[PDB]
Amino acid sequence: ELRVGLEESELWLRFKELTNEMIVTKNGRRMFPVLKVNVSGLDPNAMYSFLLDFVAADNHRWKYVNGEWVPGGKPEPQAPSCVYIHPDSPNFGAHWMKAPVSFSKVKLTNKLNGGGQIMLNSLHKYEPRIHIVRVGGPQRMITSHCFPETQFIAVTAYQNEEITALKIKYN
Ligand SMILES: CC(C)N(C)S(=O)(=O)N1CCO[C@H](C)C1
Known part of the structure; x- marks a missing residue:
């Protein structure tokens, strides 16, 4: 059976329990944490x-x-x-x-x-x-998988400083 799993779920859950935010810019900003899938x-x-x-x-x-x-x-x-x-x-x-x-x-x-x-x-x-x-x-086949653990609100700057702190602590 095709199994999809989230790598570093414990870390994503620290972000999720605070409400996760991801920066969006005109030229584009990479994500932290990075989505890594097993x-x-x-x-x-x-x-x-x-x-x-x-x-x-x-x-x-x-x-x-x-x-x-x-x-x-x-x-x-x-x-x-x-x-x-x-x-x-x-x-x-x-x-x-x-x-x-x-x-x-x-x-x-x-x-x-x-x-x-x-x-x-x-x-x-x-x-x-x-x-x-x-x-x-x-x-030919498609299998899809959602990652609720990785939910975030797109933001042009961080609102919750607890997120700012976690982003820096773990980057
Ligand atoms: C566009 C094309 C290169 N394909 C990926 S497909 O094999 O025709 N295809 C599209 C839908 O998903 C399946 C894998 C079947």
Whole structure:
């Protein structure tokens, strides 16, 4: 059976219990912590691409009000995020299972850009999600996995200084 697991969950849970924030910039900012995924149960000889997107967890704008995050009154439909292709893609099952798949080079932006960068809406809450994509033929398959532990609000600067401190402590 194809098994997907989060590497360093105990660390992500420190961020999650404070409400996690990720910086977005015009040119794009890399994530900390980095999403790292443990994958077993692939065909070592089959061909796969690893894809990363961000699901809007709710339809609301969030704001830091008197030391705490609160959702706004007026929900809007959240268009799905664009997909980031892991740069090792496409690759053999063996490549993906030999070490954690690390999305260290994805950059989160707030502006529509040349490409590479993934544009998110600031003050929206996101749930990272991967798609493992077995390419070509009649054996083609997608398996998707969400990482609730890795939820964050996109921000142009940190609001909760406890997050600022954890980011620095562990970087
Ligand atoms: C676009 C193309 C290169 N593919 C990844 S596919 O094999 O035709 N394909 C797309 C949907 O997911 C499955 C893996 C089947």
